[PDB]
From a paper:
However, we found that TMEM106B forms amyloid fibrils not only in the diseased brain, but also in the brains of normal elders. Moreover, cryo-EM structure determination of these ex vivo fibrils showed that they share similar structures, in which TMEM106B adopts a curling stone-like fold composed of residues 120–254 that originally form the luminal domain of TMEM106B in its native fold. In the native state, TMEM106B is cleaved by lysosomal proteases, which leads to the formation of the N-terminal fragment and the luminal domain. Thus, the structure of TMEM106B in the fibrillar state indicates that prior to forming amyloid fibrils, the luminal domain is cleaved off at Arg119.
The PDD patient was in the late stage of PD and manifested severe dementia symptom. We then were able to unambiguously fit TMEM106B molecules into the cryo-EM density maps and build structural models for the fibrils from normal 2 (referred to as Type 1) and the major species of PDD (referred to as Type 2). In total, we obtained three types of fibril structures (polymorphs) from four fibril species extracted from the brains of three donors: Type 1 fibril in normal 2, Type 2 in normal 1 and PDD, and Type 3 in PDD. The Type 2 TMEM106B structure fits well in both density maps, except that TMEM106B dimerizes in the minor fibril species of PDD (referred to as Type 3) via electrostatic interactions between R178, K180 and an unknown density. TMEM106B conformations in Type 2 and Type 3 (dimer) are nearly identical, while that in Type 1 is moderately different from the other two. The fibril cores of Type 1 and Type 2 both consist of residues 120–254 of TMEM106B forming 17 β-strands, which are arranged into a curling stone-like fold. Residues 120–160 build the handle of the curling stone and are nearly identical in conformation in both Type 1 and Type 2 fibrils. In contrast to the identical N-terminal handle part of the structure, the stone part of Type 1 and Type 2 exhibits conformational variations. The overall fold of Type 2 is rather flat, while the stone part of Type 1 swaps between neighboring rungs. The protein segment (residues 174–186) forms a hydrophobic hole in Type 2, in which unknown densities were observed in the fibrils from normal 1 and PDD.
Numbering used by the authors:
A (entry chain C), B (entry chain A), C (entry chain B): 120 to 254
The structure:
Amino acid sequence: SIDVKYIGVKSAYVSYDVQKRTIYLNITNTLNITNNNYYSVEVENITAQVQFSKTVIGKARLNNITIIGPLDMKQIDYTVPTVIAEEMSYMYDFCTLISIKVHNIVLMMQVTVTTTYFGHSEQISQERYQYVDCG
Amino acid sequence: SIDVKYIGVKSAYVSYDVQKRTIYLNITNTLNITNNNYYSVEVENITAQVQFSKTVIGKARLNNITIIGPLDMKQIDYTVPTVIAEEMSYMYDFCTLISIKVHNIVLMMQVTVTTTYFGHSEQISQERYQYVDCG
Amino acid sequence: SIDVKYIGVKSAYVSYDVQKRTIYLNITNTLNITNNNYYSVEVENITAQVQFSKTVIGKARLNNITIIGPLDMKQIDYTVPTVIAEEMSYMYDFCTLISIKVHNIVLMMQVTVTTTYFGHSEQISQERYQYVDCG
């Protein structure tokens, strides 16, 4: 990868930015640029590539075979009872949360059992996260 | 990888930035640039690449075979009972949280059982995180 | 990898930045740059690469075979009971948290059982983290 940048606020080549309650008087500028970028990414000069796969079974006897794939889940349990009794009193709540399995991002590729691969593979993730905000 | 940058606020080539309650008077500037970037990334000169895979079974007897994949889960349990009794009193809450399995990012690649791979593979993650904010 | 930089606030080539309550008067500047960058990353001159894999089973007898993958979980348990009784009194809370298995980032690659690999592999992670903020 090339130039995978995360900028918090602002990005530029040249910036003359002026913000607040300042004062200019008689400012002069100038700029001369000769930029050039000969990207030559991910090029191939191949004569004979032979991917392959096979299986040969002869005079065999096979019984009770099991091939699971990854990331299984079984017999899980969640129990979040919230009981509230009360009598002749005073209560008050604010910004109460109960969270179970709260996802944000799930990126999956080549999640297989068998995988012959030739080439490139990328996974990029840029974000600004904030779960709870109260006051 | 090339140029994987995380900038907190601001990024530039040249920056003349002026912020607050300042004073300019008779400023002069100038710039002469000859930038150039001959990226030649990830190039191939291959004559004969032969990926492969196979299996040969002959006059065999196989019984009760099991091949799990990675990242299994079984018989897990969570129990978060929240009971509140009360009598002739006063209560008050603010910014109360109960979190179970709160994910943000999950990036998975080539999560397999068998994997023949030829080439490149990347995984980039840039972020600004903040879970709880109260007051 | 090349140029994997984490900058807290600001990044530049040249910076003339002026912030607050300052005073300029009759400033002069000048700049002459001849930058150049001949990246030649990850190049290949290969004549014959032969990845491979195989299995041959003959006149065999195999019984009760098990091949788990990595990162299993079994019979786990969590028990966080929160009981509150009260009588003729006064209570008060603020910014109370109960967290169980709170993830932020999970990056996984080539999490396999078998893996023939030829090439490159990267995993980059840049972040600014903050869990709880109260007051």
